[PDB]
Nucleic acid binder design. Sequence first.
RNA 1: UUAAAGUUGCUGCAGUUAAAAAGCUCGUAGUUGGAUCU
RNA 2: CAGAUACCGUCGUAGUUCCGACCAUAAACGAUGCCGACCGGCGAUGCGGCGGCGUUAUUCCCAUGACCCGCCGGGCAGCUUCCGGGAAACCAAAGUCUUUGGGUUCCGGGGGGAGUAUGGUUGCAAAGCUGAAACUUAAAGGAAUUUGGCGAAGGGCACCACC
RNA 3: AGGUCUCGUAGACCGUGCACCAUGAGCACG
Lengths: 25, 221, 217, 83, 71, 132, 129, 56, 101
Amino acid sequence: MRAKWRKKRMRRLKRKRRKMRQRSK
Amino acid sequence: KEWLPVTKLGRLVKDMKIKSLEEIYLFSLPIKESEIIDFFLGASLKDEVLKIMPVQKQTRAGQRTRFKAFVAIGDYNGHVGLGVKCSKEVATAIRGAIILAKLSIVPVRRGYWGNKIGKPHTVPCKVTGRCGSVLVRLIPAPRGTGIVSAPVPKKLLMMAGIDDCYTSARGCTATLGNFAKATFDAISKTYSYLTPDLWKETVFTKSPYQEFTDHLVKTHT
Amino acid sequence: SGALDVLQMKEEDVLKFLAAGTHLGGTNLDFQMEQYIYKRKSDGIYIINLKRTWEKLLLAARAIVAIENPADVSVISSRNTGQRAVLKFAAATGATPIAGRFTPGTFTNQIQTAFREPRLLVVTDPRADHQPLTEASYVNLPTIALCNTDSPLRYVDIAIPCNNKGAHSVGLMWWMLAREVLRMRGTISREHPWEVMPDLYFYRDPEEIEKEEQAAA
Amino acid sequence: MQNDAGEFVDLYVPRKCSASNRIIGAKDHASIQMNVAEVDKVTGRFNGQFKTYAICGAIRRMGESDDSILRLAKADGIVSKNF
Amino acid sequence: GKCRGLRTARKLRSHRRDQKWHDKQYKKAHLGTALKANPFGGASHAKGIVLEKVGVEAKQPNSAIRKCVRV
Amino acid sequence: GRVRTKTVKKAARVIIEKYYTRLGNDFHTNKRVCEEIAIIPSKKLRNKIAGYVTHLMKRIQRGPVRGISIKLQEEERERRDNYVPEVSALDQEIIEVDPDTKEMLKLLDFGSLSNLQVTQPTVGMNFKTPRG
Amino acid sequence: VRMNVLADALKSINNAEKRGKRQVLIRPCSKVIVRFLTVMMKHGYIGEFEIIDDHRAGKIVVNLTGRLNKCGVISPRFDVQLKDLEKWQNNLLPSRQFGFIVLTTSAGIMDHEEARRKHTGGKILGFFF
Amino acid sequence: KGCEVVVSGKLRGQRAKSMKFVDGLMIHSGDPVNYYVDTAVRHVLLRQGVLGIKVK
Amino acid sequence: TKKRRNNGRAKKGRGHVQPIRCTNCARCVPKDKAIKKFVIRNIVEAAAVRDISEASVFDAYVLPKLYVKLHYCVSCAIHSKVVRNRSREARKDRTPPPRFR
RNA sequence: UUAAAGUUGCUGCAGUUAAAAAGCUCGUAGUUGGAUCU
RNA sequence: CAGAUACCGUCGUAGUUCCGACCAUAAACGAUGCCGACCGGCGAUGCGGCGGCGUUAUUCCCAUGACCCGCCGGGCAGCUUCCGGGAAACCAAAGUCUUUGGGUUCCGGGGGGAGUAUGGUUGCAAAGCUGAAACUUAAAGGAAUUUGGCGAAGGGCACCACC
RNA sequence: AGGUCUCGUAGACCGUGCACCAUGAGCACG
Ligand SMILES: [Zn+2]
């Protein structure tokens, strides 16, 4: 697991968490 | 039983023409056989094995293990030396390291702390030594202090003649070979330091290969 | 060399130098040779001052005669233009010659058969014979070199500046070095020449030997 | 090295270099006991006089020592001043 | 040090403060989170009530089961 | 092939460097010489030793020596070394002298001599053949 | 740019001492360099030296002698008390039997040995041994 | 002029290993191996098995 | 670790070099990194030169040459045996190999 | 908690490859400032 | 292909092009901050200047452009070493360092968690800057030798390989 | 007036390209 796709997946997870936060509030 | 000399210096040593090894160290003549040291210096040569460690390289025959032995030789009011030998059998490595340490011994001079009374006890100045990444410092000490160090350079310093010092080490001290070699380099650099009382213009005597040319031309062939 | 006027260019040593081509050297200049030089000529050849060459030769002869045992002088030559010269020099003065393939560890390995203990070392060329110089550096051995303008200078105590691509110059300088050593030692008077042959130190190619023996009786 | 009591309690003194005034260690094998001879003033023959010079090893291995030999000989007087 | 000036000392003091704050043991010892998260609360010994007895497995080279108490 | 081993070669160099005066160029003579002076437990070893001795004797009498030293000083070339030519091959009446070294000799110890002449400067274009 | 002529000059003469040279060339000039080298001159570490004075900041040519180990300079110019002088030479000089450290006394530029017997002290310059 | 011993069998373990010391010159080929070396093979009885000893 | 004194190219004071396409591949390789092949050949070389020589209407007609320049990616250069790999001490030989044939 | 820790380096640490110099440049505070006067 | 929404081939949207409004991220790497002093050689390259045989823009005279031989200053770079340093790869800087101080900014403290959570800030957005803790671990790492293992490249041998 | 000038030799490439690679149950002894 190289760092580029790990950072891409972590960015997607952060975007999902943030957009869940803005749908919740 | 009887040692036959193979060099000119050994022949002049065995002929009882040369007086001491003092002028041999003065003229920096190399020594290649282990008979001048025990011919001149008496039975004060004390040996201590330091550490016996195994090294190995692997082949189809498993791996071949060889043993490296560290030993130190030298009288307790004078010279000191260090030798490294690697061989297959332990006692052969011990004897080879003893011989190689007996060849490589150096003279040291001892200084004073404050007052120049009695016999000298400490190092004349602050010398240093380098081996790999091991840095050893030798700070002079007042009389009746004792060497404060690790066990290995402390035992080198009691077996080297002096009795009081302050030391400081920096680097990977755990590798005993590099640390012992750095300590030996640091104590061997005692005469490589300028001191203002040695500012008298040096006088050159005859070379030790020069007084006895007529002796050696019919003695050594 | 001495400030007294007894050892100088009398009439014909400079003529022998100019006949042998000793005054001209290589096309490249070492930075240690800025004072063993007169002036570069045209087409990039450097001119060696013969007075300084004679002065260094006199100093080297003084260093040779200073010791008293002639068996402690060792001369080295591995180049093909100088095997005969060191053998004739060792026949003249009693030195020890090594001509061709100086084995390593001659002065270090004390258990091999090729183990000699000298007190003064003379070498022909420092560039082609760096192996005797680094071997002699491990012991207390002074070195004398017949060095060139392009020759590097390391582990050399007495340096005589001359060309080495010409066998005539090498043989002439070896002959006159033996001449000066025998003169200053006390065997050859300076009032008359002892010169048996100046070409006795000269290397000859086999084809030139063949045509010489064909032309001669 | 002198003490307060007035004895040479140092066991030996080593040689000093004649070209850089540096000290020579006991294990520095690249030193020379140079010997140069003089000539008689009337005949140019051997007399028996020596002039000993010493060169340390760094002067050899660093690149130049023959020039130091020239300065030592011009100071001594063997090499003439015109050169 | 590197910044070596006679009439400067607060730059060296602030740099030493930041580099000492940017540590591990000093940051553990001088923050309330490490003392708050400690079960003992900064005490050498503490008293508790035994409620369960369990058995945990050991590591990979050392194969045994250890008896431990939930308190 | 007929490539011989190191022990026959080492015996041949030892017996050549130790004996050259009583050593001949005939194979059957030096076979009996080697049997008289050395002890060989075989026979083909004697044959190989004497053959290599004859080969190196003809090689050292053919021309120069490179593998071993000389004690007889290789008389077949030492006689040519002992001929003294009547001309010295250095005292030429005309010596080609560049005017730069001529003006170097104006100031050293001498003026103009009989064997010294001045040549015009022979520089045509340049030097230093193109390598960089 | 250049901010201390004494440090650069002393580093240059240290480099040439390590390099085995006989004569040096210091590019700038000042009083304190002249007094520092004449303290060394009176202490016998260095023999002859010369000054090349043009109509600008001059140059100094020093005839060196092989009796020098290393010369050092301390920047910035620290304050030295009479009770702090031994504290400095304990961890700065290699020994107490030799080696000298100089300092700016209000009466001249001078070493620590005479400063011990003149009961005075000031800002520091450097050391030599 | 030379010596050779070898011991085979179990030696502090379940498996059997061939253990050997060498010292001096050894010759293995030709005719003079027939009248210089001497080979002696013997069996040694233990409580866990047998061991072989060969000496040259 | 550091392999070469340079970095596999000749860029020393530029930072950016105009990339070029490979010949066998289509890799966007920089100009100073790619191995450059300049081959001088003719239309026919040995199997038809005499057959043209006695089928041409012009006597002593020299055959025209073809001049092309090839840019090779490093993988394509190793795969087509254009350049090989040497030892550690023999890597620092900037001279071209002797073109005997 | 202190020394060992020259693993917080003021004395007295490191920054090519082991953790590490902002992508580069300008610029206000703070830091450091050539020689020369008895 | 066992399995391809991968390697391959044919089409193909948004882009790839320009004008204006945005964001400020790369192995933005010489993985080496800036200014200044000192410490070896050699051979060429680019700019400007200086000096000196000879040839050419045809044959005589001047300076010009081209060529050759040196020198000076700045710059991109190259080869060798007991100057010296480094753990070693290697380095004219990564040297002048326990014999530790030329001046001055930024930054690192075992490995993960983690450039993550939270807060602030900027942005239409994508995101950028600032930036933890709990918990877990005795290793994670950097150089360089010896057989090894290459769907890596060569070289040699064999009528149990071939012609 | 002759008629076949003399001497030595690498002068060698060039319809030539290859699919099909997944996994290792463990591991002594002084
Ligand atoms: Zn390609």
